[PDB]
Amino acid sequence: SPSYTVLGQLPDTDVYIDIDAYEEVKEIPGIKIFQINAPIYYANSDLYENIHTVILDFTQVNFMDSVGVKTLAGIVKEYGDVGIYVYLAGCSAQVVNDLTSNRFFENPALKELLFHSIHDAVLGSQVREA
Numbered sequence: 001s002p003s004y005t006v007l008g009q010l011p012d013t014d015v016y017i018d019i020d021a022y023e024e025v026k027e028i029p030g031i032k033i034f035q036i037n038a039p040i041y042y043a044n045s046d047l048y049e050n051i052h053t054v055i056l057d058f059t060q061v062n063f064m065d066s067v068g069v070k071t072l073a074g075i076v077k078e079y080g081d082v083g084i085y086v087y088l089a090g091c092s093a094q095v096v097n098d099l100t101s102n103r104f105f106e107n108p109a110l111k112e113l114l115f116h117s118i119h120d121a122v123l124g125s126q127v128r129e130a
Helices: 040-047 066-080 093-101 108-113 118-124
Strands: 004-009 016-018 031-036 053-057 085-089
Touching (some): 085 118
């Protein structure tokens, strides 16, 4: 898939890379990690268990359009309606602005889905309100 990559954890490190890039790299039980490689609505086409957290890595994203934010907003909600948290990791200041400008954080509570690194978001799923 050229539009998203499944990431895994290099054991006993905070390093997260393509699950297919290295043998010892393993997905974390309970967590799906997806590196966004194209605008999210193209990866959304591919989207269309026992998973408690979905981490989206935004390190490769430089900006978002209104259509992406709406799409992301929808993904966050419909996962959340079944108790699954969608975390956003590695959003730049610009991407955060784009989310804000398109009223993604209309509910200030959604600010809690922002994490700096993938590892931060993994730790953030460890204990949290049900």
